Amino acid sequence: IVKNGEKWMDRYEIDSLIGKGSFGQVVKAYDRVEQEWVAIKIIKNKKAFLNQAQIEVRLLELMNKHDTEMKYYIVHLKRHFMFRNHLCLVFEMLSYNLYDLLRNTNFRGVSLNLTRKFAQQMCTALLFLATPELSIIHCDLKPENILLCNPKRSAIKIVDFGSSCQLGQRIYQYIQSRFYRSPEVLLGMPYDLAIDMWSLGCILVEMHTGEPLFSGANEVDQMNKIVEVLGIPPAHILDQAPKARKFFEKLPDGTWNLKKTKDYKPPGTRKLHNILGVETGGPGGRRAGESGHTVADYLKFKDLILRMLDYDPKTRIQPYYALQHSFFKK
Numbered sequence: 485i486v487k488n489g490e491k492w493m494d495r496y497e498i499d500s501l502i503g504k505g506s507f508g509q510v511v512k513a514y515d516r517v518e519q520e521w522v523a524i525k526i527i528k529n530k531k532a533f534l535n536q537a538q539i540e541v542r543l544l545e546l547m548n549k550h551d552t553e554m555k556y557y558i559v560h561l562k563r564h565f566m567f568r569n570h571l572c573l574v575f576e577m578l579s580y581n582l583y584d585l586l587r588n589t590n591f592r593g594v595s596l597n598l599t600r601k602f603a604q605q606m607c608t609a610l611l612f613l614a615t616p617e618l619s620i621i622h623c624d625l626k627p628e629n630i631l632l633c634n635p636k637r638s639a640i641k642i643v644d645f646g647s648s649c650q651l652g653q654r655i656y657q658y659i660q661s662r663f664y665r666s667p668e669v670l671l672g673m674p675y676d677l678a679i680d681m682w683s684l685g686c687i688l689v690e691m692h693t694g695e696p697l698f699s700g701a702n703e704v705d706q707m708n709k710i711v712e713v714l715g716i717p718p719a720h721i722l723d724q725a726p727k728a729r730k731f732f733e734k735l736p737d738g739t740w741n742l743k744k745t746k747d748y749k750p751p752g753t754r755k756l757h758n759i760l761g762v763e764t765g766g767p768g769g770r771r772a773g774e775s776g777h778t779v780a781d782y783l784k785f786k787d788l789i790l791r792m793l794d795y796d797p798k799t800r801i802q803p804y805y806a807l808q809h810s811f812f813k814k
């Protein structure tokens with residue numbers, strides 16, 4: 485839609501394409517007023533994308549009118565305007581995303597120490613979104629949506645509030661990227677901020693192993709891969725779940741089991757202990773003997789992840805309590 489060298493509103497000079505989304509495109513541009521480069525998110529000229537992007541603008545502006553040390557893990561929306569019938573969101577420039585970081589490791593993962601730094605910033609971000617007057621559910625956390633602030637540094641920010649909603653302003657039943665989709669969403673249940681913490685747990689294991697924890701090809705495969713690691717979800721959750729019978733079957737004695745199709749490891753036998761290599765030199769043993777990768781370091785990480793992957797969104801660890809975990813103690 486946009487040429488390089490093109491000038492908008494005697495303010496912005498378009499340089500190049502940064503990225504394309506379902507929403508439209510992101511371009512690098514020079515702002516002559518501030519005298520800085522910015523990223524402009526250009527929404528498609530169609531009602532569906534316009535209306536959802538108007539929600540993104542509202543939630544970013546809501547976040548910006550809160551000045552607390554907790555808010556600086558969200559990309560900064562500088563302003564927005566309408567141009568040629570496209571809503572245009574102007575952000576600060578950021579660097580490459582955590583998927584690019586994994587790709588750059590040949591999908592062998594970053595160190596437990598770099599994983600910890602990401603975890604601590606993401607947990608702080610989620611604590612900010614949980615502030616009562618915000619209560620923002622990101623709904624699409626994944627490596628692609630976490631960007632480095634600076635290619636020399638390990639500071640990150642979350643981008644893409646395109647799926648996001650406040651608690652009690654849910655639109656879609658089917659949300660989150662499948663690999664990072666919470667059990668409560670797979671099961672058709674009303675969701676709250678705890679779905680982001682599920683995504684985060686998935687993301688942190690992936691950042692350290694190089695590979696997605698739960699790479700379902702569809703929702704049935706997704707839930708089966710979750711069950712391999714974490715077992716059958718508890719009956720009290722399945723009993724209240726609209727879509728339990730998409731994946732599970734209830735038995736005479738009021739118990740639940742997998743529906744099986746034609747031929748997964750038996751429920752709960754694919755141990756996070758072994759995925760992480762807690763006692764076997766880390767993922768594929770590639771961290772054997774490296775500092776900051778002892779059994780004790782690993783056990784703390786495993787414990788925090790298993791708390792983030794609680795099936796029960798009620799007892800799943802919350803951002804403040806995640807920040808107090810031993811994994812983050814020097």
Ligand SMILES: Nc1cc(-c2ccc3occc3c2)ccn1
Nearest residue numbers: 502523575576577578643644645
């Ligand atoms: N909210 C939002 C923000 C971005 C965004 C914002 C700044 C950026 O700098 C480099 C890439 C990049 C992408 C993309 C999509 N949604």
Ligand SMILES: [Cl-]
Nearest residue numbers: 583626627696
């Ligand atoms: Cl991915």
Ligand SMILES: [Cl-]
Nearest residue numbers: 624647659660
């Ligand atoms: Cl979504």
